[PDB]
Amino acid sequence: VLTSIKNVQINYTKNSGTVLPGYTPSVGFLGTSKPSLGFVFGSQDDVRYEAAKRGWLTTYQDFNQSFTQVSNKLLKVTANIDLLPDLKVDLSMDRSYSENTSEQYSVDPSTNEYKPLSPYTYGMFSISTVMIKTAFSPSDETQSAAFDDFRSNRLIIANRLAEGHYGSGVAIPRYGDANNPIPAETDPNYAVYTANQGYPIGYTKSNQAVLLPAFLAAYTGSDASSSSTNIFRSFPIPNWSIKYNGLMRYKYFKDKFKRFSLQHNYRASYTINQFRSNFDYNSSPKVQDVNTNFYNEIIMSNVNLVEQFSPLIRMDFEL
């Protein structure tokens, strides 16, 4: 029953790059192999600590040039299915992930230890998903079921994140309990406490880690009690294209029809145009921001869910 599939086109491209400054030794007439033979031929493995130990990194303690790494991953799986003799289905699964890391470095005068300094990361992400479960729901300036789900799932996601943080060993601290009472009206945080009283202390309604997975679950039709709270998705959900020259076979040979074809397309993507590492997410005792939200390891500005029926339907028939 699985013989319907005909072809499975899989494309996987992985680009990598590494810029290391402070490389004191020179090269020979025919080239060099001083760091490692793999590095010249593209190992991309760590050589910074090895270079520091070997002693051929800059000894300047105020080196202003930054070690840099770049990685791009692109998956473009394509498949074809022939469930019916006159029905053709094309499935596509796309996933792009670009990650650029930069960091300054120093070399210890003693023991020649490679010490990183201020490492940060950024990049882009995109993955094919399916959000057709809420595609046909009515949504306008007066009503929206998906937006109501978005409003409702915030508390569920906040509770899940609190359970992840507070491992159920003690009662989850909230803004409405006696331990964290609502402050006076003159207190700067009175509005924040009053706006979200039943939410955990570190997870308010404006916390990115709270309302990003809530948004994804609400607009993809997933259940907030079991949807993934992770920023990045690993398995792309296939988008589909359906063609059907089948209705002409029933009785349309002599029923005044000479051609008939139905076409349908659905393609949806989830994209983070610019995510990056947060310097505030460190080992320092300061864990909350001005909004009393726990700092997130990865911070982003916009997340885009694009859905496109192109076309939603195409009836092409000639009499």
Binding site: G164, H165, Y166, G169, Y281, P285, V287
Partner: peptide, 22 residues
């Protein structure tokens, strides 16, 4: 303890469920 510190998940260089002496 862990529940009064960085939680059961922790962060980088600090594993979850670890006591912190300050």
């Amino acid at each position: 303890p862990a529940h009064l510190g960085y939680g059961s998940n922790g962060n980088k260089t600090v594993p979850g469920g670890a006591v912190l002496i300050f």
